[PDB]
Amino acid sequence: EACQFSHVNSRDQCNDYQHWKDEAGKQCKTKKSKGNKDMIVRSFAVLEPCALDMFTGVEFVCCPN
């Protein structure tokens, strides 16, 4: 019912801030609730650090808005 939390972080998953912003967006959009519903992305911020301008993983929140 309420908003849900979802993150993506792996050893190879190393992408730029902007790149993640888009990916995290698709991860939530493509994802759905038990009732095959839809959910947007309420919050978003990178997690683990990667190369100069990259992150090994990213965390983002989803909402049924």
Swiss-Prot record:
- Spell out the residue ranges making up region: CuBD subdomain: 3-65
- Its encoding gene is what? apl-1
Q: Which residues of the full protein are shown?
A: 135 to 197 of 686
**Something else known:** Lacks conserved metal-binding sites and has only weak affinity for copper in vitro.
Q: What is known of its domains?
A: The NPXY motif mediates the interaction with clathrin.
PTM comment text: Extracellular region is proteolytically cleaved.
Its protein name is: Amyloid-beta-like protein
Report the SS bond pairs: 3-63, 14-50, 28-62
Q: Where in the cell is it found?
A: Membrane; Early endosome
Q: What does this protein do?
A: Required for normal developmental progression throughout all life stages. Specifically required for the molt stage during all larval transitions and morphogenesis. Acts with heterochronic genes, including members of the let-7 family, to regulate larval stage to adult transition. Acts synergistically with acn-1 in let-7 regulated postembryonic cell division of hypodermal seam cells. Acts in multiple pathways to influence daf-12 and daf-16 activity to in turn regulate physiological and reproductive processes such as body size and egg-laying. May play a role in neurotransmission.
Q: In which tissues is it expressed?
A: Expressed in the head, pharynx, spermatheca, uterus, vulva, tail and ventral neurons. Specifically expressed in nerve ring interneurons, the ventral cord, socket and amphids in the head, with strong expression in junctional cells, including the pharyngeal intestinal valve and uterine seam junction, and the excretory cell and weak expression in epidermal epithelial cells, including hyp7 cells, vulval cells, rectal valve cells, pharyngeal arcade cells and the tail hypodermis.
What is the similarity comment for this entry?
A: Belongs to the APP family.
- Record text on subunit structure and interactions: Interacts (via cytoplasmic domain) with feh-1 (via PID 2 domain).
Disruption phenotype annotation = Larval lethality during the L1 stage, with the formation of vacuoles in syncytial hypoderm, organ morphology defects, and molting defects. RNAi-mediated knockdown results in a reduced body size, transparent appearance, sluggish movement and insensitivity to touch. Delayed development and a molting defect that begins at the L3 to L4 larval stage transition and continues through to transition from the L4 larval stage to the young adult stage. Increased sensitivity to acetylcholine inhibition. Increased pharyngeal pumping.
